[PDB]
Amino acid sequence: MVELTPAAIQELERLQILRIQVQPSECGDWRYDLALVAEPKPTDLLTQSQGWTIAIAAEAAELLRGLRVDYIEDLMGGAFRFHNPNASQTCGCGMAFRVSRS
Amino acid sequence: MVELTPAAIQELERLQTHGVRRGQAAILRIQVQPSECGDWRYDLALVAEPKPTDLLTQSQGWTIAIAAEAAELLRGLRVDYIEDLMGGAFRFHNPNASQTCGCGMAFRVS
Amino acid sequence: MVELTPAAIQELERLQTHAAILRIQVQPSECGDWRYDLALVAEPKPTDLLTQSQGWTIAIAAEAAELLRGLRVDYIEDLMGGAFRFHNPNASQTCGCGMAFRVS
Amino acid sequence: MVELTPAAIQELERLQTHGVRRGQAAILRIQVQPSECGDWRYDLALVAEPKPTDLLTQSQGWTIAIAAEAAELLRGLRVDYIEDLMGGAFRFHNPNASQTCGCGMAFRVSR
Numbered sequence: 444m445v446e447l448t449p450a451a452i453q454e455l456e457r458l459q460i461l462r463i464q465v466q467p468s469e470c471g472d473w474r475y476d477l478a479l480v481a482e483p484k485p486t487d488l489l490t491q492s493q494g495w496t497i498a499i500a501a502e503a504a505e506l507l508r509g510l511r512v513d514y515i516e517d518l519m520g521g522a523f524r525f526h527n528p529n530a531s532q533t534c535g536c537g538m539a540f541r542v543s544r545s
Numbered sequence: 546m547v548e549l550t551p552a553a554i555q556e557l558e559r560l561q562t563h564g565v566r567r568g569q570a571a572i573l574r575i576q577v578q579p580s581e582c583g584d585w586r587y588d589l590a591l592v593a594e595p596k597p598t599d600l601l602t603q604s605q606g607w608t609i610a611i612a613a614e615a616a617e618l619l620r621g622l623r624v625d626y627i628e629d630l631m632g633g634a635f636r637f638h639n640p641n642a643s644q645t646c647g648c649g650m651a652f653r654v655s
Numbered sequence: 656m657v658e659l660t661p662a663a664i665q666e667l668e669r670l671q672t673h674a675a676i677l678r679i680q681v682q683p684s685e686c687g688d689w690r691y692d693l694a695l696v697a698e699p700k701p702t703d704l705l706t707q708s709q710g711w712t713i714a715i716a717a718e719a720a721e722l723l724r725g726l727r728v729d730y731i732e733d734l735m736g737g738a739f740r741f742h743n744p745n746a747s748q749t750c751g752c753g754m755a756f757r758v759s
Numbered sequence: 760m761v762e763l764t765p766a767a768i769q770e771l772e773r774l775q776t777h778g779v780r781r782g783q784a785a786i787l788r789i790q791v792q793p794s795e796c797g798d799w800r801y802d803l804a805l806v807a808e809p810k811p812t813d814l815l816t817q818s819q820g821w822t823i824a825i826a827a828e829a830a831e832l833l834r835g836l837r838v839d840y841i842e843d844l845m846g847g848a849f850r851f852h853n854p855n856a857s858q859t860c861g862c863g864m865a866f867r868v869s870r
């Protein structure tokens with residue numbers, strides 16, 4: 444359902460399982476919300492991929508099926524990056540999107 | 546959990562018939578789906594002055610001015626700021642913006 | 656009134672050093688929202704969460720539960736007629752922009 | 760900005776009686792509210808006076824008050840009233856509207 448680039452994984456050792464959900468946002472409609480968690484909500488959609496579990500929130504499946512997550516330090520600094528095939532628009536930074544109206 | 550005011554109940558109750566809509570068991574089932582809605586975006590600015598017309602409150606010893614006319618939308622706004630994995634962002638909480646209005650199809654025939 | 660947490664004061668105090676009057680205005684915009692699908696149904700799905708308000712059975716989709724917690728459903732007739740009003744304290748929460756000018 | 764058909768006027772004076780929740784002034788206050796259908800639902804109230812900050816329009820011996828933050832969403836709205844089997848309903852034709860829901864109460868604006 445969802446992938447992470449090896450690059451993201453390792454920024455994820457950074458622990459000084461991952462849970463992707465969305466929240467309403469000013470730029471766009473939805474901004475990704477990322478947490479490191481002890482346990483997936485029981486109804487999350489899980490994927491293995493480089494021995495990590497990825498917890499997609501079920502209500503957001505529609506908004507996230509197919510998602511790609513990468514870490515890049517570029518000229519704006521270091522941040523997770525997102526290639527969401529469901530995004531019909533992403534803000535400038537990539538962390539906010541909107542999908543097409545139903 | 547969920548509350549249904551009693552006005553929401555009569556309407557429900559009004560709805561289980563209409564036509565011959567089942568003299569049988571009837572549970573209210575709520576599920577959800579991603580959608581979008583009108584929203585008010587906040588323009589925070591640091592002026593030298595208020596307009597001779599803003600409403601001035603006080604929080605953290607900073608004065609806050611609000612446009613006379615956004616008054617109702619704005620009392621209730623709580624501005625926070627969190628840094629997480631996605632970085633650092635202001636967080637806007639407002640219970641009045643929380644009000645969404647439901648579909649009107651139940652009321653309408655053209 | 657408008658309330659600014661300590662975490663937010665510090666992030667503003669930060670910026671301002673790069674009289675303190677913060678001014679707020681709104682402009683019409685859009686954001687993402689959860690649409691509540693109400694239905695009346697015979698039985699719930701076997702995975703739903705069952706609750707109750709005033710003697711109505713309410714089945715909630717398993718995933719919707721976190722988000723629906725504290726949802727209040729009112730109903731009003733105005734000049735436009737009747738419709739449910741939904742007020743969800745959870746979802747009254749919008750995340751601001753992650754970006755800033757590099758020289759501000 | 761903002762027009763009422765006599766049909767809408769007629770219905771407005773009707774409710775400004777027989778539902779003598781009036782404010783007892785020929786004042787109609789229009790604003791919007793976030794909507795499950797589309798983006799914004801219109802919201803109409805008869806009020807006693809308008810908020811000092813609203814945008815006034817005078818039609819047909821009626822004061823029409825548009826909430827200032829919604830100016831942009833409502834400029835040039837025309838409001839009609841159509842009888843139906845429910846007793847009637849206001850209709851809105853909003854030059855700002857990019858889609859309108861099935862029942863007309865709600866509209867989206869352009870992205």
Ligand code: FES
Binds near residue numbers: 795
């Ligand atoms: S508000 Fe639901 S279709 Fe008109």
Ligand code: FES
Binds near residue numbers: 537752
């Ligand atoms: S969140 Fe504002 S540009 Fe991406």
Ligand code: NA
Binds near residue numbers: 469470471472684687
């Ligand atoms: Na937005």
Ligand code: NA
Binds near residue numbers: 795
């Ligand atoms: Na909506």
